[PDB]
Structures are given as C-alpha cells and as structure tokens.
Symmetry: D2
C-alpha cells in the first residue's frame, strides 16, 4: 500500500529511513506522502507528534508506527533493530490496529477554530493574571486563578499531565483529564485542586472574566489567541490508529519509562 | 413494593424515618428489611455505606436512596424537606435508575475471601514496614515501599482517594484508581508516584516480599489479615443501582461539597 | 519625622490617604516622598510591594506600614478603621520595629544586575524548553527540566511559593526556599522534587545548558534577560523594617488568610 | 578517650567493629559503653538512631560517628574503607564537631512524658478517626482531620517528612517542620495543607476533640498513649554532636541519596 516515513533529521534517523525505504522497495509498497495509509515515524515522540498533526485530516485512513532512535517513547515504542521486521509485516498487512482517543479543542472569538490534540491542550494568560470561569456541561464549577490549566488525553497523561500531578490513565478509557497549574487557594478564592477525569460527551468550557487574551497550546504548537469568548474541551469523535505488530502493554511502557529499563 | 429504611440513629433521622414509614402506609408499599426492593438511607454517607454492605448480596434487585440529615453527602444527596415527595414518587414507581461501578477485592491465604467496595479498599502493614510488589496484569510494575496503597471506585474518588492526591472521576467511567500513601522514593527505591487509573478487566495484584500480615480496609470495615499470599483488585461485574428521582449531576455534587454551598 | 503615603488609586484608598495626611498635619510630621522615614501603603499587598521597590535603596532608614482597604494582606495587615490610631502612634514615635529577610538575585551576562525581592524571584524559559543546572555552593546538585523555578523569602512563602507546594516559614528565620514548577522526572531526568530551604550565606546558582534567554521575575516585575551566564540566589544582607504598633502574629495572619475570618 | 561501637548485627558490621576495636587498641583509647565520649555506629541510619537514643542523656558529652555498611546514610555517611583512617583521627583528637538541632515532644495525661527525636515525631489515632486542634503559641490555628501529623527536625526532613511533601531544610537552621498525612479538606473542614516551618521557642500544641488515645512515634519507637490532654512540640535546647573528620556537605549528601551516586 501507500506509505511515507518522517525522520527526526539527525544522521541516525535519516539512514534508518533510507534503509526502510529500500527494504520496502522489495515489496508491493508505494511511497506517497500525500495520501499514505502507513505513516512511520523515526526519532522520538516529538517526531511522532509532528507526523500525527501532519496527517490529522486522514486519521481514519492511516495506521501510525513509531520508531525511537533515542530513549524509549510512548508512541515511538519500537527499536531500530526491528526496522527490518517492521518492513516485512507492514508489507504483508494482516496486522491488527489499536485506537487511542483524542482531545477536541474549540476556540471562539467575536470565527471559531477547532484543534485535535494527541497529548494535551493548555491555557495560560498573555502577561497578566490568568483567571477563568470553569463550566462543566453548562454548570459553573469554579473560578480558577493561577498559572493555567491542562486538559490531557489518556495517552497524554504520561506527558505534561504527569508533571502537574495528574493520574496516569490507560488509553483504552475514552476520557480527558483536567489538571491545574499553580492555583491560588485561600479564604476568598477556591479551586478543586484535584485532577478531574471526564467521560465522552462531557463538555468543559473556559470563559474569561477580565483579560480575553490567552496563550493556547495544542501538543507542541503554542499560539496567542486574542479576543476569545470561550475555550471548549471535549473528547474527540476521531481516534488515532496504530498498527499493532506485537504486544507492548501500556503499563509496561509506563514501567520501562519511569521505573527501570 | 417491598422497602426498608435505615437510620443514623440520632433523634432527627429516626423521626424522619417514622414519618416516611407512615407516609408509605398510605400506598401499596410493604416494609421488609429481608428482601427489600427499595433501600432508603437517612443520615450521612456512612449510613448509606452500611445500608449498601447490609444488602450487598441483592444488589441486582435493589434501588438505593440516600437522605442527608447533616451536610450534603455524595450518596445521601437528598434533603429531609423532600422526604414527602420521595415517598410519593417511589410508591408510583416509573422512576429511572442509575448504576455506579464497584471494586472487587480478593484476598488469598495459604482459603480466599472476596469483598465489594463502594468507596475504596486500602492496604497497610501490621506494625512493621509496608513493602509489596505491584503486579499489573501479571507484569511486575513496581516494588512499593511506604505507608500503604488505596484502590478507589469512581464514586469513591471524592473520599480517601481525594485526600491522597488522586483524581476525581465521573462515576459513569467503569474504572478503578490506585493511589499511594507516603511512598519512599530515592536512588534505590522507585515508585510511579502518580495515581493510576485502570479500566475493566485489568487486574492489579499486591504480593508480599517479607511480612505477610496486612491491615486491609473495605469502606469502613478494617480487618487484620494474616498469612496472605496475594491481594487482588479488579473492577467488579456488579453495580449499585440508585433510584433517580431528579437531576443532581455528579459535578454539581462535587461543586456543592468542595467549592461552595 | 518625614513620611509619605502611597495609594492603590481607587476612590477608597485615596480618601483614606487624604484623611491621614490631614491627621498628620496636626503633628510634627512632614510629608516627603524623596527621603521619608515612614512609608505608609494603603491598598493591598501589591500596593505594599510597589512602595517597597520604590524605596529599596533607603531600606535601613525606613519603617514600612501597610493598610488594606480590601481583604487582609500579609504586609497590609491593618484595617482602615485604625488609620486615626496609626497617625497618633506614628507621630509620637517610641514604636518598636520588626525586620524581615530579603532575597538577593544576581544576573550575569557576557554586565551584572542585582535585584532585591520581598516575596520571590522566578525563572522560566523564553519560548523553548527550560533546562538549567542547579549549583549549590559550587556543587552541581541537579539538572532541572520543567516549567521553571521559584526562590522565595520567608514572608514570600505565603504567596507563589505556597501555590507550588512550598512550606510556610516564619519570617524570623533567615532563609530562602526553592520550589519547582512542573518538573520532568523519569528514568533519564531527575530532580529532587521537594522544596529546598537554604540558610544565610548559602549560594544557589542556576546555569544554562542550551538556551541562554530566560524570563526572570522579581516580585511583580518580570523582564526578559538575554545572554545570561548565571542566575545567583542568596539571602540578602539587607532587611525590610516594619513599624510595630501592636501584636499581629504571623501564624494568626496565616490563619486569618487561609483558614477562616 | 572512652569510646564504644554499636553494630547492626550482621556478619559484615560485626567484623568491621572488631577490627576498629583492635585498631583502637593501638592507641590511648578505652572501650566503655557506659560513659563513652565517642559513639561509633556501624550499619545504617537505623543503627545510628538506636545509638543516639541509647545515649540521649549524655548528648553534651558525646560526639557521634556513623559508618554505613549498606547504602549511604544521612547519619552513617562514612564508608567502611575509611574505618582505619577514622580510628587514627579519633585517637589523636583535635577534630572539629558539628551540632544538629533536636525535637522535644511533651505528652500530658490526667503524669507528663518528654521525648527527644532526631528525625521526627508523628501522631495518629488508635483505630477511630484522627481529629485534633492545632494550637500555635496558644493561638488556635486549625482543626485537623486526617490520618495524622508529622513534626520533623531539619536533618529529619530527608526521612518521613520528605515522603509527606515537606521541604528539605539545611540542618544548620534551628527549626522544626510540621506536615500533614492525608488531610480532609472540604467546605466544612479546613487545613492549611502546606508544611509549616517553626523557629526556636515556638510551641505547637495538639489537643484532642473527642478520642483521647493516640499512637505516638518518636523516630523508630511507636507507643500507644491513653488519656492524653496535650501533645506539645518545640525545638529542643539540646543538640546532637557529630565528630567532623572531613567535609561532606549536607546538600551533597542529599544529591548522593536522591539524585545519583
Ligand atoms: C518534548 C518533550 C517532552 C514530552 C515528550 N512526550 C511526548 C511528545 N509525548 C509524550 C507522552 N505521551 N508521554 C511521555 N512523554 C511524552
Ligand atoms: C466518615 C467519613 C469520611 C468520608 C465520608 N464519605 C463517604 C463515607 N463516602 C464518601 C464519598 N463518596 N465522597 C466523599 N466523602 C465520603
Ligand atoms: C497580586 C497577587 C497575588 C499575591 C498577593 N501577595 C503578595 C503581593 N504578597 C503576598 C504574600 N506575602 N502572601 C500572600 N499573598 C501575597
Ligand atoms: C528505616 C528506614 C527509613 C528511614 C531511614 N532514615 C533514617 C532512619 N533517618 C533518615 C534520614 N535522616 N534521612 C533519610 N532517611 C533516613
């Protein structure tokens, strides 16, 4: 089928990419970076994120693969020594696929932009103090005052969400998790503190109180949005599809990354 | 139908119980504390827990109701001023039901005991240091050294789980959450730190390394178990059924309990 | 003696300022905002901070006073209803003074700037990832990777330091406290996690590893510094002097601000 | 002078103890475990704690030494390969001493017991819920509801205090640090959350509200106290004296124990 390979760009990932292309040349495989069915990422999880956002409009037609040339990644979870075995099994097909949930972010102005996040989406203020009203399913839940907020996907829980005290969730759970950054809590100002885990169809809305400019990030992309009336979080109806070439359990990936080896 | 009412025992809950019984006497309702179909709890969440464990073997045949005579509870979430309205709508029937997931705990010795938890189940040592090997789906994940561990249901996340830094999960998510109590982390000893959220069919196993006696709690009940080979956590196949007499969203219950009013 | 009064600027603080000036006109008191011996702040703690930094070069010759027209402040800890009593006792003199420690921040480039902080000084990256080597008394302690770091004074511990999990320290302790913002900790990257409390004469040095541009804050002032070789923290030899007109213990100020009333 | 050596009891520490005794036999040194001036601990920090509590009534007349036969300890911070060099320099004398602060715990009943802690002192309930009123310098600060409380010395901050989120304090600071264990915080119940650092002469008092039986620990010793009216914490007037045979900075000891090597 049609495939493409993206590379981190260093000497090591480029040479592995050229070898896989040559290995694919021995099969009924066509290189196409416009309408690929297999997207192979060689480098790290950041390389995988760029590959994901590069083709975030053909997600239902693409199975992703990650190869880590550095340390183990949660998306780039296959070693370079398995590149030849990957070429063989991807060419035969007959492989199984696994799907992870995604986060949908909607930004409304006074004009509405939607984004797809594989890891998380964060909101901070542009200079001044960050104060937003948190609305859960049209119910005002809290007035947050602090550095910012982070809404994470299940597979994104091991990234920025973990550094903010959030829980690690198995990516088979269709949910999103909201965590706080340095919240102010006193007699006057009150936040829940705890991370919040939301199922599908639950809508979390952030609404400004004074300043209406925010620095909004979606995975690696961070942009200053001006004159926004609402930031809207929801579990996406779209999923990212991975090609499953053997068993590498998520909890083992968590152990190998944070505990040992 | 058949019903029963449990009371916290104070003058206030007993008098409300007698008034509801008399109110039920005006309908085709029979008081039966042996095979009830409606279990009404009057008092607090602790009163509701005892009602749950009192009938934990007829869960598929019982719809529970909680009335709080003190502060708002997450299970006793109806005010005493609505007792007359509750009697009317429970007698007519035609009410909808909602179901929350439960936690199954299995204790094995050298002889195996199973327990059902509505909030959480905790493990600590009996005197000496608490060290266990944490096994996730037959994969050794970590060697935990600390005060203990807590596995919580979704509706139990607002209880002891919250005090340990765990996330608040919407009870429509079929999952369990493991949190740590005062873990030792240094160059030699390593724990994940973060709370872990597990879906259905995932089995978390605790296995002793030296001392084989542990103080195991299930909701309010705490017992010393001796000569245990394994503690086994899993999302239960059973659910607790609530009678739904109006809309009181979980996130609103969280706001009313921790934020304001 | 010579005095001056700074105001938050709202109608309420300005009118209280004019009344105290008129009240001071009934005593041997001279208004002088160039070489004052008494600096009275009317507004909030932010108003007090600006008054402090306005006269941070005559600290050994000034006794500060804070009056809060809004909620209770840790520096503006006197109510407006006591303004007349403050005028009387400040004019007589004979009042006792109390001193709080300060934080000295030194920034070195490739050209060296020193700053005095009453609350805290923070360091973050300008866009890219924030990675610094933490050096304690010329000993390399850790390579920090995360959002940033915060070094707080004792009286500053109740401000941003508290939101980052730092401890509240009694301001009679001559020390500084370093806290982390969203640190990355895995098998490869290691931070201490815990807040660190340093005595006098201890020097904490932050040294860049790649990017040499950082957003450095000192209390309310936040500036982008380019081409910095070292950020250097130390407990200042200077102290801020408060005029003590009655007993308002720090721990009571903490209780009134975070617990109740 | 007079000396004694305590051993962890394993084959390795006993043989090192016999070799140091024989090495001391080549000098004007007398073994005396009743009135020693030098107390050498061989094993771990737990071995050092027992040596400290064994002679906690001759603290002003004893210089302590710790040798770790296992991993590095914060009190047993000298390797076995330096035992011969330690014998030489302890026999000559002329060594410098360093002193660490200690924690004084007073327990009052309806009859008053005082204890000296090198690491920390903790309070928990005996079975039932743990609720105490926290009184700081005769001012009611908070009503604590949770698992328990921990008051730590500066050198004890790297032990249980660290596992509870407390800050690491340099042991030259004469202070104590109070940390919370799993506190309940909601609309009804309020705790400060943050760790609290107290200077000398500050008295922290714990007073019961209902149950008057508590499990009180002092370092390794844990005892059930019944019918207690007050638990009283204060920085001790006594200090523990270490013999200083070279420079091993506390922050380096922290790095070697938690960061690397
Ligand atoms: C650059 C950088 C730091 C984050 C790396 N990273 C990414 C891009 N995704 C993940 C993930 N799912 N889990 C852990 N780590 C991750
Ligand atoms: C007694 C006592 C303290 C816990 C009260 N409590 C119970 C029994 N369940 C819950 C719950 N689901 N959420 C919050 N709080 C709860
Ligand atoms: C604006 C704003 C938020 C911080 C207010 N604030 C200041 C300026 N100092 C302190 C302080 N020492 N303790 C608590 N809060 C403080
Ligand atoms: C047994 C056991 C666990 C604690 C060991 N330990 C002791 C006895 N003191 C300390 C200390 N000052 N810093 C770190 N760790 C310590």
């Amino acid at each position: 089928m049609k495939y493409m390979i993206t590379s981190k760009g260093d000497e090591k990932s480029d040479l592995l990419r050229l070898n896989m292309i040559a290995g694919f040349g021995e099969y009924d495989m066509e290189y196409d970076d416009v309408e690929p069915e297999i997207v192979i990422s060689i480098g790290g999880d950041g390389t995988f994120l760029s590959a994901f956002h590069q083709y975030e409009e053909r997600l239902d037609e693409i199975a992703f693969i990650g190869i880590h040339t550095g340390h183990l990644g949660f998306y780039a979870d296959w070693r370079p020594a398995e590149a030849d075995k990957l070429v063989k099994l991807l060419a035969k097909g007959e492989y199984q696929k696994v799907s992870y949930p995604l986060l949908k972010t909607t930004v409304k102005y006074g004009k509405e932009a939607t984004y797809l996040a594989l890891n998380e989406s964060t909101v901070k203020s542009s200079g001044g103090p960050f104060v937003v009203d948190v609305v859960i399913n049209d119910i005002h839940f809290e007035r947050f005052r602090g550095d910012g907020l982070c809404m994470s996907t299940p597979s994104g829980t091991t990234a920025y969400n973990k550094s903010l005290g959030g829980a690690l969730m198995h990516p088979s759970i269709e949910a999103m998790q909201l965590t706080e950054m340095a919240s102010i809590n006193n007699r006057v100002y009150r936040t829940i503190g705890s991370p919040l885990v939301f199922p599908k169809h639950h809508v979390v809305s952030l609404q400004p109180v004074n300043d209406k400019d925010f620095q909004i990030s979606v995975d690696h992309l961070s942009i200053l949005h001006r004159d926004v009336q609402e930031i809207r979080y929801e579990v996406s109806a779209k999923k990212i599809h991975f090609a499953r070439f053997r068993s590498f359990p998520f909890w083992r990936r968590v152990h190998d990354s944070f505990i040992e080896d």
